[PDB]
Amino acid sequence: NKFARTVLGDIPVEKLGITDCHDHFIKNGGPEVEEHIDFLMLNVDASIKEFKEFIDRGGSTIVTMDPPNVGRDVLKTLEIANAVKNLGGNVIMSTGFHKAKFYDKYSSWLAVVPTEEIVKMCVAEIEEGMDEYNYNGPVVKRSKAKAGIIKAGTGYGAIDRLELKALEVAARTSILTGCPILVHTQLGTMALEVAKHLIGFGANPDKIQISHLNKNPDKYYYEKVIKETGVTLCFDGPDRVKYYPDSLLAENIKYLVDKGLQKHITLSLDAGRILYQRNYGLTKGKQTFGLAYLFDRFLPLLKQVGVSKEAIFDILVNNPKRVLAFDEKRNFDPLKVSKEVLELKKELNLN
Amino acid sequence: NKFARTVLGDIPVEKLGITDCHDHFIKNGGPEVEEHIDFLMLNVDASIKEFKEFIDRGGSTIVTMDPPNVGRDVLKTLEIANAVKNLGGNVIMSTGFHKAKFYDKYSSWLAVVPTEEIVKMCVAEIEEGMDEYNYNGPVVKRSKAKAGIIKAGTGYGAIDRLELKALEVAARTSILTGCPILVHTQLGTMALEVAKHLIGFGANPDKIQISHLNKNPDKYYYEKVIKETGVTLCFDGPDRVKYYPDSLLAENIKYLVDKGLQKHITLSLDAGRILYQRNYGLTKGKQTFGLAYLFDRFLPLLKQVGVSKEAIFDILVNNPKRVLAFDEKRNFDPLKVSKEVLELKKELNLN
Amino acid sequence: NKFARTVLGDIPVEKLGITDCHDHFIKNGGPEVEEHIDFLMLNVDASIKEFKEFIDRGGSTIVTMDPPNVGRDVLKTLEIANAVKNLGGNVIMSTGFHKAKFYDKYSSWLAVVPTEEIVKMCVAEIEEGMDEYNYNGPVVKRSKAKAGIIKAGTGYGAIDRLELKALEVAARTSILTGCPILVHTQLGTMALEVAKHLIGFGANPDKIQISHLNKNPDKYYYEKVIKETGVTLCFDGPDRVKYYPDSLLAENIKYLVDKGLQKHITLSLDAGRILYQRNYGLTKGKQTFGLAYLFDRFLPLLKQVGVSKEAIFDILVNNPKRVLAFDEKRNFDPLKVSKEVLELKKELNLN
Amino acid sequence: NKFARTVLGDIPVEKLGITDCHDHFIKNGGPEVEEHIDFLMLNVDASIKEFKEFIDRGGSTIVTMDPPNVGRDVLKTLEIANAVKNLGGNVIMSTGFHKAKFYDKYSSWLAVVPTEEIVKMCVAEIEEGMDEYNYNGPVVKRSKAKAGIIKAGTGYGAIDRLELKALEVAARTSILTGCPILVHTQLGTMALEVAKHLIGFGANPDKIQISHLNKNPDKYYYEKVIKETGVTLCFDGPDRVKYYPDSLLAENIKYLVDKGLQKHITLSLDAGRILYQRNYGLTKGKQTFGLAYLFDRFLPLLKQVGVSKEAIFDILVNNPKRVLAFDEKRNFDPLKVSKEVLELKKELNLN
């Protein structure tokens, strides 16, 4: 009797269906918008339209990976989820943290608040309800919607002490609530160490997804991470030509499948800029691709390069059915934390 | 029987002595540091040495104007206060807000949390204790030290809707607790309108300082603001040549005193960059001026252009003793808010 | 028996009334918007409201100084004019050019097209109708509305060769049509030389206004320019604190009046950024000053520093009535251009 | 009996010879130069020397792809063409448009002037003569030289509404005059959609080249575009290491040849920065590669990876003889435009 926690309540995992495991609709301000205006995405109407295209093509579930302090909007996302619920659409929202670059290293709550206290706060979003004020300040107003996954983030070619902190937070929260974990890696760097640290803390590899490996297109590395740790690689990459062509990802996915690793791969669009969805594009007077592109162009390319229907079905349906399912709750035991992790925490002044 | 609220406790106002009404020692990250590395000031020893030169010269009290989310550091500022208390040094800390530039207009708590609830949070800093975590997230740990003034801020040539919200917060908190108010203006613009709105909300002009008028060196405007509203103008500007020479502030002050407005003037250094203090300067391998310059150079210049010792004594001692003294508490009545302010809030979508 | 040429037709100069000699409402794209998004001003309703406030205070005429290739929008500006005509509002539009910084120095029509052909195009806007496509390409579609002044612009501390060319275009078009001229100077530099070159070309000093001298607050210079050339100084500057305080402009205007030069001064707000008007400011969620500030704040300051009622009446009414009045048409004789101007044109490679 | 339209007149296509399908010599100002001084290219002598090296290696024709408003220089390009005509050199110039980013979205003639009128202006450059003033304003002075191709451009990962407008201008101009079309794509994105839209408007796929696919090195995509639409891919990329190594392009071209697609490929250097030509390089005191590199290095690399001498002959000679040849003139019939295109124009607010 396994379940996934959607903003509208817990569902049996058999109801996940085809799942986009890392995406966006609303990004309401926050540090990312600070980097470029294209990250501001505030249109419920355009988001609903895009979600309906995804559903038209066969999809059901979208995991919106915005942590409370970086863009997340509970109220507007709830509007979307309610608009598509009668159509079979599901939304899972996230608690937790993004990479350190997005938090003030001197005075942010990630930096200053004891880990145990931050855990209580992320547990509360998984089990009681998400803060409608997104943990922006001292006033909290909890939604009835709960988060169903927790996030952490690592930076370019380095795991910052605060990132190791957030990973500990992810692991403990997952340990305590049973919830899945997904981690943003920057250009697909430090993926192996992210998995190792999470597992070293006590997290279940079965519940771990690592995003953005597409930006480090090293098929050997992909296979190493999977075989050494048992985690799952959530790829984005389709229609991101300023990074890498679609063909590059299709062939690296084929390799992993040929090596028997098809149960450890999920897909996403990570459409987290305004021009990365079709309907959002229209609001900007532009023709752009969005969620339908996955079905209209990328999956056919997977088939063309020789990935089987069966492996595609694992990627879209069975793998997410597994990695997003809640585990049973457990106690967190500090004495089970690996020595490698403890020694790193000491080196990084985290205790 | 009036008192001022210092971080070490309430003191009779006769103990304030010569008072620097707007300054800094610790700025611990935050949005300002984002603009320039020089805003990052993290040295308690350097701070204490500088406070001791200020005291050596005759000073006693420094009001550190850092609102919780912009640079404020309760723990480190307490270290500084404790180091000089036995020299008769006093530190007053601030609650409230800075100008809107420093808050995410979409998702910050200033933008999203109801005024009433923000007021509760600022009142608690004045009456229970400041959050050691500086209100930068949902976990709060209150210090024994309380804030003794509340801040608001306005931007260049404009009062943003969120700054009008912070001004209502400042007025409400002040009304409820009796605490003084100090408002940052940007280049000394909108000073008149800040005064008017605060009074319109029901705040006491006797408790209101407006900072930075020295950056809009308009003697007629100074006089207008003081005569029309009865607030106090807190000038910084000594050793700020990239803006205006010391002589200009000296002459403008001479004019106000000659007009009979000496009770409406306070002074400060606003040394909110690392090269604005002597001891901090030495930590970056430079000779720089700081708090002692007020006495060694600027007051002699005041005397030189013809400001009397009595007027100087009001500026440094009697004025602060008045405007920093807590008022008798009142209840806030929203129906007594002025029609001009009600109309503005409607126009800015605040109600 | 003189007329001014408004976008709704020529009017007796007695109908000009209180005139704002340099301002803006619509800035639709162009080189300025490239410098900052605040230069984009596209709101007809907000413009009309601001215009009505100006009329409410006693104003009648506004001269929108937008050359065709820099922001001008004939269609939207006509909407504003028609909205206020029944209130006695007048709008005068501009042909000609901005400072060289706004024109490609290699390939723009300013750089490349022979002066005589450019003159014909500017004459045509004065005498047949403004291009609704604003001279931004090879297709022209003329409005029934004609321009009633021509602009040129000079840059910081320099008159560029293309700017001398635009000065020649201005002088020739004014000579041929009788139209007035207004020149933008950058920070009030080169104003004397602008005056001299135009007169050198054959332009009537009586038709020439030079803007932005307020940004070079040198009373002796103001006096020199007026006494040596007889042109008119159009000041902006109220509520522009980042440059200079209102008080400085007032006192410099008092100086000029005291020297007998009150017939050579006009006033303007030059509200050419979106936060420089009250109603535009509301569209961005801010309280700001705009056109009414001239009457509510700056004119009373002029009185307060001692400028006579007659001088204010000249500045606001009689001087605009003189400088905006069309001259009798003349022919331009090139062999009559001053020797100073001829030599400079050789030096700058303009033949 | 087919001709190509060179700046020196129409020539039998058999006289095209080896053809560089996308290159540059003169870039006189314009928006690109605004991006980087390196785009400014003004040296006729250096350009003629480079052209002579190209001829010395066996080249004959160079298509210079500068649309009127972005860099184009009729006078100087004619100087180049006249200097090499007796050496067998041919120059073809372009009318039409660059990508939207290079035009003011509010006030540029692309934005504001009705499509039909723009078409007339582009047909005129093809059939009467190019404007020596490059359509940079309201004065036109036609050269005897005519353009022999029309350009459009699309931006990164999107076709802007104005770009769809320029594509319609390109299709209509080609249908009306018979001229060929070349489209800049940004990083090789949206190539398939560009092809379908042009075709949708009624353009002859046989007349269509699309540039920059080399920047999206996806052999499957290249193949899809060619097979589904019949257009021709004009690659640049030799000696552009900051994007991709020569080897990648060579291997992708080999792939296309192996799949039977060798008739759908042309080559170019797109030497549109000053350090992308040997002789221009010399003027800046640098050793750099230029046009000769095509023959000295890249074509030998194509042989090395196994591209047949026939495929290479097709790429350099036969394919350009087909794609650059004028079609018989036709009438444009709006009712023939595809439903997909019509629906998109509605979605983009283009009627």
Place this chain on the structure above:
Amino acid sequence: NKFARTVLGDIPVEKLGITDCHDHFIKNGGPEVEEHIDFLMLNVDASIKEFKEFIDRGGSTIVTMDPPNVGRDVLKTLEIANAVKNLGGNVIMSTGFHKAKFYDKYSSWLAVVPTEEIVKMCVAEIEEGMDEYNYNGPVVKRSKAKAGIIKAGTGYGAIDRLELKALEVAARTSILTGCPILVHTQLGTMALEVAKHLIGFGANPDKIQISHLNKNPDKYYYEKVIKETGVTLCFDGPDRVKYYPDSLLAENIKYLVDKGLQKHITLSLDAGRILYQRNYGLTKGKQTFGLAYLFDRFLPLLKQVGVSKEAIFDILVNNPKRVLAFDEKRNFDPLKVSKEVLELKKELNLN
């Protein structure tokens, strides 16, 4: 029998005539040019013509204040000097250093080489001949031309430890050789301390000029510096409207003269950007002001505001004849350095 040291030899001070005490003609690369292309000044012919206008107006001597590492060009400046010597023109060149901003703080020779060794190098330039390679590396090739003054520089609102070192270098060189000193202040800040420090090292106030006080227009400050130290203030400022109007400097000079301080003022244009000279301006296709403006515009303004002809003769002729005259050689005794200076060197880590 005093002499000044020009690049063509020692001259009797009576041959100085009207002397521009801080200016430029050639700025050949260096750290300044890295800040803005406008600092690049390479035109000997334009420089000569400008010098000739200066001479035509009555001027004789120009002190070019470029220290060896920042822009200085011995070869080209000699060309200029040689072209005007027969017109009675003199060029004095400089040794020493600019402000610390222009030297690598970690590894520049100023940072790393012991003070004593640097003094030897600067002494060599005054006494044997300037390095034609400008001390920009290990290979030295001395000109027959000697430097006739030594420079030092201080930064904004601070004297950097490396600037104190350079001040020590300046004092020691001056004490050893008798040469005069000129110090650039940044925005006219720290002028008092520069004076005190040089004096505390043992330099003669009679030989000291401090530049750029015009950027800190505080008349009381000017008087304090002169009255307390006896140094000379070298003003630039004419036609630098982006800082301050000419009228401000004229009035502040009038003040100093009225206080009996006319012997302590020199003048200069500091035309150290390419548009700050008339002839250089012409090479850029612009009309600009330069050296002649001193005589045509600024000196008449001085008279206008009431500065006497005798005060003006001092500023131009008598004062430079005093401050630029060599002192008799003396010995440097480090034991005689003021306690204030010793104390600061310890605080700044300079031992």
